[PDB]
Design a protein around this ligand. Structure first.
Ligand SMILES: Cc1cc2nc3c(=O)[nH]c(=O)nc-3n(C[C@H](O)[C@H](O)[C@H](O)COP(=O)(O)OP(=O)(O)OC[C@H]3O[C@@H](n4cnc5c(N)ncnc54)[C@H](O)[C@@H]3O)c2cc1C
Ligand SMILES: Cc1cc2nc3c(=O)[nH]c(=O)nc-3n(C[C@H](O)[C@H](O)[C@H](O)COP(=O)(O)OP(=O)(O)OC[C@H]3O[C@@H](n4cnc5c(N)ncnc54)[C@H](O)[C@@H]3O)c2cc1C
Lengths: 230, 230
């Protein structure tokens, strides 16, 4: 079930990173926001037709009592309907939103059931999701963050703070760069959350399973976008 | 004159080796970056007072058009105000920086005026400076690199690539270990750049002059730190 949402504000978090604030009073009814919770939007055709384009974006602000919420959107090159929308939308615009397909992230209750560390892999598009994860990881658990870099402005996108976060930025030469940048160490009992580009995710998953020995139950991997395709 | 710099990013190049990225548009108004160029930072008191502590760090990244730059910092043991800062600083923090007393490294333009080889001596603290040197040494000039080792993780600190680079690692038993490790060979017309610990440098200089026959003008020696002293 979709809901209509009205844009109320727009803030430039980084030069190519736009936070769009909306309101949808019935959206969060029985829908609890978790780390990496996301929404489907039906974005308008920039060229003016009635065709709409469904894209996914992570929730970065939420107030269930008012239905106010926000999403952070990368202004990527080349552009698409959603990033064009982020660039040009003004408060007062409306858009249909839906919550369906989103599984949350959670740290186990028992400390002795928790991973001995989190391996987070993504880029600018999954930084909202990864930031939500970092904000809930206990302070005594280390975090190895790998961010595939596409522009110099990427370093300006704010990251969540954590006392045991170690950040690694990866220059993308091809789809093999992200998997090759991963440190070869002991990954025993670690948990991996990966939301990178589709072509890079393929070679990342292969490395996690075969070389790093990650079990399936300790990996969540979803392609957040695809190079050269919608 | 100092300039205010804002921290924009932090990356863990090695487990005890942190690259801190900053921005300061006015810094590169009168500063030209050369190999081994360094800056003076006024680090804050980790204990929370108004006292500041001036320390030197090598420029590893620089963009004069935007004012963005980076330094690589060793997380040493025992810690000091600067390495504590490297461990604990978050993006958005500010710090005063100054360029004063920094002389660069250069290779003679005339090939017949160039050294027949480069003898590079240092450790993790002078590895950013040494890397900058390696990157500009012509491919037909051999490089003999000696790095005094303090921890096993020191081999994880990336070195610059060079077709004629030969690396030698030295375990430190005392201030005499580094000098004794140097190979006794013909060093005629070689050039030496040395930035090790102060006590080790004293005995290195003596061996360069008294035993290896290095002229004073073919040697650059600068102590980068002192054992048991701030
Ligand atoms: C669960 C989920 C959550 C997501 N959350 C976010 C979020 O919070 N913030 C965010 O910015 N993105 C997020 N994404 C990714 C976003 O949906 C994609 O980037 C999407 O393709 C952008 O839609 P678009 O209309 O702008 O471009 P599209 O029409 O899909 O593609 C047009 C062109 O732009 C390229 N392109 C698309 N995205 C990128 C990109 N990041 N970087 C470089 N090039 C790109 C494409 O390769 C293509 O060539 C999420 C994806 C998923 C699956
Ligand atoms: C021109 C110049 C450029 C330099 N560039 C760099 C650079 O790019 N990256 C870098 O990491 N360092 C660099 N150094 C060395 C750095 O300035 C010293 O390590 C400095 O002492 C660090 O300041 P601190 O506050 O962390 O420790 P301090 O307060 O000075 O000393 C605290 C304690 O830690 C010890 N200690 C200090 N440094 C080290 C060290 N490397 N290894 C082991 N023990 C140490 C000291 O002996 C002392 O006991 C440079 C020095 C010079 C002169």
């Amino acid at each position: 079930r979709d809901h209509q949402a009205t844009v109320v504000d727009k803030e430039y978090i980084a030069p190519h990173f736009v936070r769009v604030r909306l309101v949808s009073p019935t959206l969060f009814d029985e829908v609890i926001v978790e780390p990496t919770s996301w929404l489907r939007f039906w974005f308008p055709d920039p060229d003016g037709s009635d065709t709409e384009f469904q894209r996914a974006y992570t929730i970065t602000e939420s107030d269930p009592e008012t239905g106010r919420f926000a999403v952070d959107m990368v202004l990527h090159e080349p552009a698409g309907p959603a990033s064009t929308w982020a660039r040009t939308v003004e408060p007062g615009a409306t858009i249909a939103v839906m919550s369906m397909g989103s599984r949350g992230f959670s740290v186990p209750e028992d400390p002795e059931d928790r991973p001995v560390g989190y391996l987070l892999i993504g880029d600018s598009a999954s930084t909202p999701a990864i930031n939500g994860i970092i904000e809930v990881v206990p302070h005594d658990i280390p975090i190895e963050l790998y961010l595939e870099q596409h522009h110099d402005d990427d370093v300006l996108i704010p990251l969540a703070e954590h006392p045991r976060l170690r950040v690694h930025r990866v220059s993308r030469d091809d789809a093999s760069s992200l998997a090759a940048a991963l440190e070869l160490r002991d990954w025993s009992n670690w948990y991996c959350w990966a939301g990178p580009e589709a072509g890079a995710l393929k070679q990342v998953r292969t490395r996690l399973r075969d070389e790093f020995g990650f079990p399936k139950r300790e990996v969540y991997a979803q392609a957040y976008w695809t190079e050269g395709r919608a």
